[PDB]
Amino acid sequence: EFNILLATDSYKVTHYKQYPPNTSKVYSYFECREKKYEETVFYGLQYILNKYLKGKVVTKEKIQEAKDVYKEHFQDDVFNEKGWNYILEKYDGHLPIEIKAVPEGFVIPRGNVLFTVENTDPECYWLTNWIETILVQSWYPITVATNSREQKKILAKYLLETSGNLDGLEYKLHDFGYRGVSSQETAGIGASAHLVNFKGTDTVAGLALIKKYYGTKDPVPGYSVPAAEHSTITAWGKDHEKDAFEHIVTQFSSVPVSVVSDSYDIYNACEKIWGEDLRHLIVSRSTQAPLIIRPDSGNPLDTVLKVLEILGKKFPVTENSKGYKLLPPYLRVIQGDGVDINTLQEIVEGMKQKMWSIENIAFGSGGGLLQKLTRDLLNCSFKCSYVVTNGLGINVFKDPVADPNKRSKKGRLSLHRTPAGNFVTLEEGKGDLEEYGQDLLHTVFKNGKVTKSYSFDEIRKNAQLN
Amino acid sequence: EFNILLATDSYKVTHYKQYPPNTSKVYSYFECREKKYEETVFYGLQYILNKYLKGKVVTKEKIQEAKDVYKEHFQDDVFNEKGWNYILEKYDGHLPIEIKAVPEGFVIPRGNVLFTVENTDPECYWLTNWIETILVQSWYPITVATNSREQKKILAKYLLETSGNLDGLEYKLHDFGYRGVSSQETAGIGASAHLVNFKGTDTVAGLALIKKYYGTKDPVPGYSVPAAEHSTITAWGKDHEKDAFEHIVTQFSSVPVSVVSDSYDIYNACEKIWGEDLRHLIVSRSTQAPLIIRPDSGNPLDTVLKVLEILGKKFPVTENSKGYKLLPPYLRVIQGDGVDINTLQEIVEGMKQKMWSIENIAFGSGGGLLQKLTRDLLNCSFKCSYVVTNGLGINVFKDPVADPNKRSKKGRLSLHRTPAGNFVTLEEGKGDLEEYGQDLLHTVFKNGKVTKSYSFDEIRKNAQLN
Ligand SMILES: Cc1ccc2nc(-c3ccc(CNC(=O)c4cccnc4)cc3)oc2c1
Ligand SMILES: Cc1ccc2nc(-c3ccc(CNC(=O)c4cccnc4)cc3)oc2c1
């Protein structure tokens, strides 16, 4: 069972003894610090609030479990048993904490406050930064959603230029990353962040998370299609790849079906098997049930161009209104190997230079989409900016001499949209002057209750592209 | 609640209709494919077996939940309800699967079979690769433990060369990565893998995982020390950094204490505050309660060298038997910023060139230790190598023409220890002759039961260095 008393950096156990005496308030904030990724999608905090922070999170058994662990962990008795018992007795195990945050799905430029945390009881000054570790992990859904959205910008640009519209954009980047992430929980978190921007996923864990913690009026927030893996091809034997292809496309004759075609020779498979031997089974397929050919090895751009060239010689290629080549509607391609934001850019530019419409292709991304990301990509950071000690408020900050990029903000913070539509974070409590509009940070958590929730539809709407 | 019917890649739902008709057996294996990191630590499978695969994992309610999700997910009725109902009725929801694996903690060279999976009921041919996604996630504990062990090799070599012994080696790489990983579950898994090689961690989640799933004869597998963060320094105000330092080292006068010293000026803190104003509180400390100075910004190597040079002018430095400089025993340093396996090598090499002993220092690693890792680092992969169709066993494999590095093995596999202590993987069932000895793969899971378990002490012994 999860125990919030055991869900922090070990050294934070010792911090209640280190603050200035008579500290009654510790006020801290989260930002994606300025160091491309000029704007970030704020997403994932609601999951953390509901799963870990709300309700009765302190019990007498959890206090004793933490006391016994930390006794051995530090070889010393430093655990603040009295502080946690105070929360258990006065608030029935509810955290005396207030959290204000920008609405989820909001797209905020780097270097702005995204949420703030402060204690609501003077006895619990130490609690604000106790939960830093749990809250900082929101870097991951933020970073997945942001990196996924940046790839949507690339796809939208090249889809618009080669087709004149954005039809099918929401299905052009498919989540392949279930096996390539570090845990089941990460898979669900990361997949849901990708679904902020797209509707195609094979990481089923993301569906249950959205349903339980955000909710959507759609039947499911993400969709997939029947498809083969190498095992369902290679199980037929090396000499019977054609029989495997024939069986699978016949089993799935009325729906879209993706067949991985590089088990032995992707180019042979496209030219001879799909393009000749089984060509009669492909050209008869409906527009809503195309064959999707999946290469999965080699240089991603060179393979895509070589596959398109081969398919263009065996199947009738037309030209769309913008003048770019378009496979017949019963034939599409997905490149699901070696795809990250960098190679995605190279492939669509390479296809455009060869006058291929992006309508022909979608992309599958696994580790590049959900795992090859770190907290340093957006510099997601949690810092104390304001304290009250013996009734005196003090604006606090760090400013390391050897790294000015690590300087943190001072005092009580607020986020505002200027009349020109820019964003500004006001420091030192200057938001009290009301020079701008209302503070964009709203109370989402207070004293054990989630006070403001967003549906997955609202988040998707807030995160739309221009 | 976890539902194994929803814990797979979406497209695997459709694979039972894609295998050759009358397929009764699908046999698959896991390896860290060939083409640094020449040997891998096998760790983490036992966690997956107990938490996700053992016991009654199929219920009628879970079948209905999966049926509803996949109906909307595919906009189609493709879910294999009949196959999962059979397992519920025939085996009381226990998976008819056998898994054989190398003992956890074993250090195996790349390109060897690590575990195999096969169905034990011919009706459940499809189940072997259904659970590929869950099992492939063992890449993460394998990769964390392997990458952590390689850093232990680097530290051991330079600690031995600069000091003549290995004292304190198991505390030279401390886990700082709780906030920098993608989820709570990842934190526990990754922290436990690091503790295979070291005993210093602040990611508390690793302790509970080891206690629940592996066990150790000591009360806890990992330890930490009291330490400050920037907030317990900066909360005193910029003009009172000295007062914060004094308060913290006095609170923790009899135990080791780490004080982050770069909030405003690391060089001022070492030269003026630690080196003059508070020097009398440091030189009086015990050898078992040193002050640990923590820089946290700037170039990691240059900052360490500049901090050590400053301390050498204010504190008595000796030269050890090997000829390297050594701080007094009441004063140590931890570099916990910008550390991964690459910068760790550069720092200890840089310290050696300046004649500084590794005895002086430990390293904290966060994202670099637990998050900046992907499945392609060791090429952890799961592939079907053997099937039975119409009573005929067929050795199957993939072999993409454009990437021979992705070729997979053929037939039934076994792992053997050579007389010289090497490892060899025999393919095509050729392991039955036992020319070098018994198969090192042992059944760890069969028909819903974990049949072989290892303690964390056994794993640590298996994963030790030469
Ligand atoms: C033009 C166009 C538009 C939209 C498309 N959607 C797909 C598509 C969706 C789903 C899958 C099945 N999943 C996998 O192959 C897989 C592989 C590795 C790990 N996990 C899953 C295949 C293809 O292709 C499209 C093409
Ligand atoms: C020579 C020597 C040997 C062994 C040592 N162990 C430490 C040491 C252990 C633990 C902590 C406290 N944790 C953190 O500072 C922290 C920072 C970020 C995220 N999470 C935690 C400090 C220092 O210093 C050593 C020095």
Numbering used by the authors:
A (entry chain A), B (entry chain B): 8 to 42, 53 to 483
Question: What sentences appear in the manuscript?
Answer:
Nicotinamide phosphoribosyltransferase (NAMPT) is the rate-limiting enzyme of the NAD+ salvage pathway, having an SL relationship with nicotinic acid phosphoribosyltransferase (NAPRT), the key enzyme in the NAD+ Preiss-Handler pathway. NAMPT exists as a homodimer in solution 29, 30. Monomeric NAMPT has a modular structure consisting of two domains. Two monomers are arranged to form a dimer in a head-to-tail manner, where the first domain of one monomer is assembled with the second domain of the other monomer to form the active site, indicating the presence of two active sites in the dimer.
The asymmetric unit of the crystal structure contains two dimers of the complex, with dimer-1 composed of molecules A and B, and dimer-2 composed of molecules C and D. The crystal structures of dimer-1 and dimer-2 were superimposed with a root-mean-square deviation of 0.204 Å for all equivalent Cα atoms. A4276 nestles in the U-shaped central β-sheet of the second domain, adopting a V-shaped conformation with a kink at the C10 atom. The amide group of A4276 makes polar interactions with Asp219 and a water molecule in subsite-I; the -NH group is hydrogen-bonded to the side-chain carboxylate of Asp219, and the carbonyl oxygen is connected to a water molecule interacting with Ser275 and Ala245. In contrast, only one side of 6-methylbenzoxazole interacts with Ala379, Ile309, and the hydrophobic part of the side chain of Arg349 in subsite-III, while the other side is exposed to the solvent.
